[PDB]
Amino acid sequence: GMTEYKLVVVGADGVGKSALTIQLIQNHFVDEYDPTIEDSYRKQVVIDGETCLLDILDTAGQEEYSAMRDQYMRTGEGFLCVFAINNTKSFEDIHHYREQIKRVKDSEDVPMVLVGNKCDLPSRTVDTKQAQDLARSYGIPFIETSAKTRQGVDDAFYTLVREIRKHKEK
């Protein structure tokens, strides 16, 4: 059988978690805003010549429900931590998500990738070096993406899988 990898997409509302996921899964761009309750998807892909099964949980960013994130952080194996490069507050929100994942997992060593999304947009407010420095301090990879052009979409999900493999030492 192929190995299944439980990926969880998190971040503030409106950053593009769902658009990133739907690009991965269905290869088109959701231009409309359908704020998420909770959605799960499956896709088989070849990463490093190895076929595996991605199980993607697309989560709600709604701050009102922040204390109910624990259950899915408990079961998730790796986390895509998404902000939008044109929304400074979504970038600031990253700290809270990471801290919560560590707290809920009770570990400093959790597979995660920092994703700066909407990089097709001209009105940037978060510097690439800003994000690289933070990802560096966290010890995790950083990838700029656009769910609209598809830039970096595969790289972000595949990189997260590579981080899971690594943390499992396999």
């Binding site: 192929m2 299944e4 899964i25 269905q26 290869n27 799960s40 998807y41 499956r42 896709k43 088989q44 076929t51 099964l53 199980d55």
Partner: protein
């Protein structure tokens, strides 16, 4: 000689692409003939217009119920059901075409297309063909599946016949 048949696949009525199959009549002639004849509609019924009701990414695409169009129906050209012809061929990888069933000797019209090796079905489901052209269309169909197989868009056999 092994015949070849085709499905033209549509997504919510929009053409997706053509999948062709080699049918192993040289090992499972009765089972190959059934699928062949249901793809041409030459007995007055068959696959044209039916849908793929179960798509589970990483495993398989299942369809063939043209009597009820809900995943419980189907009939063969031999009656409601016919026997497991043999289990010579195995579920070796993507593209394998095999019969669905609800126990021994309950083959009808429902079939599945493997998108991975599924060896635990060996000796239980009769393998009778393989994708020739259009594996990429079967892959594209997985875009609309889910863990329990419910599909997010309606996937249909808009046309089908013999090549």
């Amino acid at each position: 000689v092994n015949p070849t048949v085709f499905f033209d696949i549509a997504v919510d009525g929009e053409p997706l692409g053509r999948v062709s199959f080699e049918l192993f009549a040289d090992k499972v002639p009765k089972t190959a003939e059934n699928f062949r004849a249901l793809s041409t509609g030459e007995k007055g019924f068959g696959y044209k217009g039916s849908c793929f009701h179960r798509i589970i990414p990483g495993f398989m695409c299942q369809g063939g119920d043209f009597t009820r169009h809900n995943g419980t129906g189907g009939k063969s050209i031999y009656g409601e059901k016919f026997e497991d012809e043999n289990f010579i061929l195995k579920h070796t990888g993507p593209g394998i075409l095999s019969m669905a069933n609800a126990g021994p000797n309950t083959n009808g019209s429902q079939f599945f297309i493997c998108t991975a090796k599924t060896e635990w079905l060996d000796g239980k489901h009769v393998v009778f063909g393989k994708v020739k052209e259009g594996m990429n269309i079967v892959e594209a169909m997985e875009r609309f599946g889910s863990r329990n197989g419910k599909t997010s868009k309606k996937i249909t056999i808009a046309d089908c016949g013999q090549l």
